[PDB]
Amino acid sequence: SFATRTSLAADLAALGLAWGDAIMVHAAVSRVGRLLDGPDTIIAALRDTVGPGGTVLAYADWEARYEDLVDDAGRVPPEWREHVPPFDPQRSRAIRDNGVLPEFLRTTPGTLRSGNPGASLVALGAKAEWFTADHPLDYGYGEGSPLAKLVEAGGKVLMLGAPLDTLTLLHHAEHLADIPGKRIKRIEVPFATPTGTQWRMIEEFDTGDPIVAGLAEDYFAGIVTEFLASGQGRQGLIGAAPSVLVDAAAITAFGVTWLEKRFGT
Amino acid sequence: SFATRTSLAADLAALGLAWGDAIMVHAAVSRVGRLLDGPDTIIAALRDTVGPGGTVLAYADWEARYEDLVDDAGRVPPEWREHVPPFDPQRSRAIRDNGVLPEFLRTTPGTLRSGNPGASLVALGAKAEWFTADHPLDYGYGEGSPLAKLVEAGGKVLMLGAPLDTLTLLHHAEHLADIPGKRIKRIEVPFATPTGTQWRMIEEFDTGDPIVAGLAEDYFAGIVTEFLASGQGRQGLIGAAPSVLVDAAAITAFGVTWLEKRFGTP
Numbered sequence: 001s002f003a004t005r006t007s008l009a010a011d012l013a014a015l016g017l018a019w020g021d022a023i024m025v026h027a028a029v030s031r032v033g034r035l036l037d038g039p040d041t042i043i044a045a046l047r048d049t050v051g052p053g054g055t056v057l058a059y060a061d062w063e064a065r066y067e068d069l070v071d072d073a074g075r076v077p078p079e080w081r082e083h084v085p086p087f088d089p090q091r092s093r094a095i096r097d098n099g100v101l102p103e104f105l106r107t108t109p110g111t112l113r114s115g116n117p118g119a120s121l122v123a124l125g126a127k128a129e130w131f132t133a134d135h136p137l138d139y140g141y142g143e144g145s146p147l148a149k150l151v152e153a154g155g156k157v158l159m160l161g162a163p164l165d166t167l168t169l170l171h172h173a174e175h176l177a178d179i180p181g182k183r184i185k186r187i188e189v190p191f192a193t194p195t196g197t198q199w200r201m202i203e204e205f206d207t208g209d210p211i212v213a214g215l216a217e218d219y220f221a222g223i224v225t226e227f228l229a230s231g232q233g234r235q236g237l238i239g240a241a242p243s244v245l246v247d248a249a250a251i252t253a254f255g256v257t258w259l260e261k262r263f264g265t
Numbered sequence: 266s267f268a269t270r271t272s273l274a275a276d277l278a279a280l281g282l283a284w285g286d287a288i289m290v291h292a293a294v295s296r297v298g299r300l301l302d303g304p305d306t307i308i309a310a311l312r313d314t315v316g317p318g319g320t321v322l323a324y325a326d327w328e329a330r331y332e333d334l335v336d337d338a339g340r341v342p343p344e345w346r347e348h349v350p351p352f353d354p355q356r357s358r359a360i361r362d363n364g365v366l367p368e369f370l371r372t373t374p375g376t377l378r379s380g381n382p383g384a385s386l387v388a389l390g391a392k393a394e395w396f397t398a399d400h401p402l403d404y405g406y407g408e409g410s411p412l413a414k415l416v417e418a419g420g421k422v423l424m425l426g427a428p429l430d431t432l433t434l435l436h437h438a439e440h441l442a443d444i445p446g447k448r449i450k451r452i453e454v455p456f457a458t459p460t461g462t463q464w465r466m467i468e469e470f471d472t473g474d475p476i477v478a479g480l481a482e483d484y485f486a487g488i489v490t491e492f493l494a495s496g497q498g499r500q501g502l503i504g505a506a507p508s509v510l511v512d513a514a515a516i517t518a519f520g521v522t523w524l525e526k527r528f529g530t531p
């Protein structure tokens with residue numbers, strides 16, 4: 001009853017994961033079953049399937065609970081400024097909400113982490129250095145982001161037992177969509193620097209809620225569901241977890257058209 | 266209401282943690298309260314209290330589920346041998362049973378991890394290399410082990426909200442105790458090599474149960490309780506967690522004498 005890196009790789013190949021793919025994974029490890037090496041079995045299986053020319057990616061985000069202390073302009077009060085732990089791409093943990101896997105991937109020797117804290121991705125493999133390079137600090141889900149590079153690279157996204165609304169790539173569709181009423185987030189971010197802490201104001205479309213009013217919180221799952229229903233994407237089991245595999249460029253264009261059809265002109 | 270690295274260091278100083286100390290920590294991080302930097306707040310506070318001359322240590326162990334497959338001699342079935350992930354001191358996770366802190370410390374840049382998988386410790390600070398170097402693979406809780414070095418260096422053990430029965434150092438007292446009937450655990454451990462997996466049999470006194478028959482599972486808690494009752498050690502709050510701080514040499518000698526009184530003949 002032990003799932004192994006060999007058995008999971010066979011499940012991944014049957015689902016459609018291909019040699020040389022850049023694969024981004026959102027996993028609910030508790031639904032995969034008994035794993036011989038725990039969550040690292042999934043990372044090893046993904047690397048075995050894509051090979052040294054492929055890349056394994058996950059959404060890291062940043063564990064930064066100082067967000068509760070900020071005012072309405074997103075500023076940290078001066079009495080708290082020197083206590084907020086600054087962002088270090090090599091030492092800052094991945095956010096706990098994303099699950100154990102993004103942190104397990106981040107601490108795998110050889111994995112790189114991009115510089116935009118809230119929008120940061122981890123990448124391990126051939127194009128990891130390119131995926132994590134030059135992440136724009138403002139609107140880090142847009143044109144120069146790792147998510148845009150995932151579309152650029154013809155990559156794929158694997159929902160490994162995770163609820164479909166956790167597909168981070170659809171925030172990149174939210175960014176691109178020509179629709180009105182886009183919600184905006186502004187927050188002060190501390191950055192670790194060799195000379196001390198450097199504060200910077202960050203502006204981006206708010207990803208803590210749907211980009212526009214009139215949408216349910218988990219509305220991403222409805223887009224993925226309709227994307228599967230249109231005959232695109234693949235569904236199957238990875239271990240014991242019902243999983244979904246989608247093409248990054250196709251789902252992004254679907255999401256952009258989905259938003260621009262319902263909202264705006 | 267956010268526990269911070271400055272506030273936790275103040276709690277640690279009030280408990281007795283001193284500049285330059287080598288401190289081994291057993292933590293129940295959920296009891297510390299709301300932390301501004303999560304579990305890393307505790308690690309940063311410990312480093313701030315001991316300073317650059319001090320060292321922060323935790324019991325890492327090893328997350329290795331293949332023990333369920335072993336036969337009656339502790340041997341791995343041949344059809345499973347090449348599938349068991351081998352031990353890598355830099356890549357093998359800390360065991361999940363020990364809590365989030367040992368894994369967070371292990372993955373902090375600057376931390377080293379010793380080579381005995383089941384008994385491995387992590388160390389961060391001045392003596393991290395000395396604490397984790399040349400960990401004997403057999404009887405990895407005895408002579409020349411990181412636990413013996415913690416005693417050698419006059420280090421301390423911090424129970425940060427953790428149950429007193431998780432004090433790993435008392436396994437070093439179990440090893441040293443001159444008592445009969447000591448149970449021995451022997452199991453196959455895979456070691457990572459460039460050429461594949463290298464299997465080795467590991468022999469040690471069994472630390473999954475009391476060293477001798479007739480003892481309760483949490484009997485370590487009884488030793489610390491009696492150790493505190495004798496007027497030794499310090500008690501206090503670290504954040505919101507009731508904590509205990511003890512001298513590594515004192516608790517070890519207390520534990521050895523405790524076992525040699527109940528069991529063993531002069």
Ligand SMILES: CC(C)(COP(=O)(O)OP(=O)(O)OC[C@H]1O[C@@H](n2cnc3c(N)ncnc32)[C@H](O)[C@@H]1OP(=O)(O)O)[C@@H](O)C(=O)NCCC(=O)NCCS
Nearest residue numbers: 026027028029030031038059097098099100162163166361
């Ligand atoms: C939130 C979410 C992760 C919860 O699902 P989950 O399976 O319960 O959480 P995890 O993915 O961390 O998997 C937990 C399993 O991993 C294993 N695990 C967790 N920590 C472990 C550790 N230190 N050591 C070994 N194994 C561990 C365990 O098997 C655990 O199962 P258990 O708690 O039942 O014993 C999932 O619903 C989800 O949304 N995933 C997508 C995340 C994402 O990418 N989000 C983007 C922003 S929304």
Ligand SMILES: CC(C)(COP(=O)(O)OP(=O)(O)OC[C@H]1O[C@@H](n2cnc3c(N)ncnc32)[C@H](O)[C@@H]1OP(=O)(O)O)[C@@H](O)C(=O)NCCC(=O)NCCS
Nearest residue numbers: 096291292293294295296303304324363364365427428431
């Ligand atoms: C078993 C034991 C760890 C359980 O105590 P615990 O506090 O509930 O578990 P942890 O120490 O891992 O800390 C949990 C807290 O850490 C935080 N945490 C856990 N994972 C986190 C993550 N990825 N990111 C940020 N914070 C995290 C959370 O605050 C979590 O609280 P929550 O799970 O209620 O939300 C504790 O009782 C114990 O025995 N500690 C000593 C273990 C030891 O060293 N044993 C050696 C021989 S037995």
Ligand SMILES: NC[C@@H]1O[C@H](O[C@H]2[C@@H](O)[C@H](O[C@@H]3[C@@H](O)[C@H](N)C[C@H](N)[C@H]3O[C@H]3O[C@H](CN)[C@@H](O)[C@H](O)[C@H]3N)O[C@@H]2CO)[C@H](N)[C@@H](O)[C@@H]1O
Nearest residue numbers: 061097118119163165166167168171207208209217218220
């Ligand atoms: N949900 C209501 C809103 O939540 C905000 O905080 C939210 C925010 O920190 C964080 O949101 C994070 C963002 O950061 C990150 N950049 C992308 C990520 N997908 C998103 O995640 C959130 O949206 C997903 C749906 N795609 C959900 O699956 C997920 O459970 C949820 N945490 O989770 C918190 C709660 O979801 C604010 N508190 C406030 O704007 C309002 O309360």
Ligand SMILES: NC[C@@H]1O[C@H](O[C@H]2[C@@H](O)[C@H](O[C@@H]3[C@@H](O)[C@H](N)C[C@H](N)[C@H]3O[C@H]3O[C@H](CN)[C@@H](O)[C@H](O)[C@H]3N)O[C@@H]2CO)[C@H](N)[C@@H](O)[C@@H]1O
Nearest residue numbers: 326362383384430431432433436472473474475482483485
């Ligand atoms: N206790 C009963 C026995 O437990 C064994 O497994 C045990 C073993 O793998 C493992 O034991 C681990 C050892 O590894 C490790 N080298 C030191 C560590 N202190 C110890 O931990 C154990 O003993 C502590 C008390 N010091 C307890 O606080 C802790 O809850 C317990 N997990 O946890 C399991 C539960 O203790 C066997 N299943 C079987 O021989 C029998 O059931």
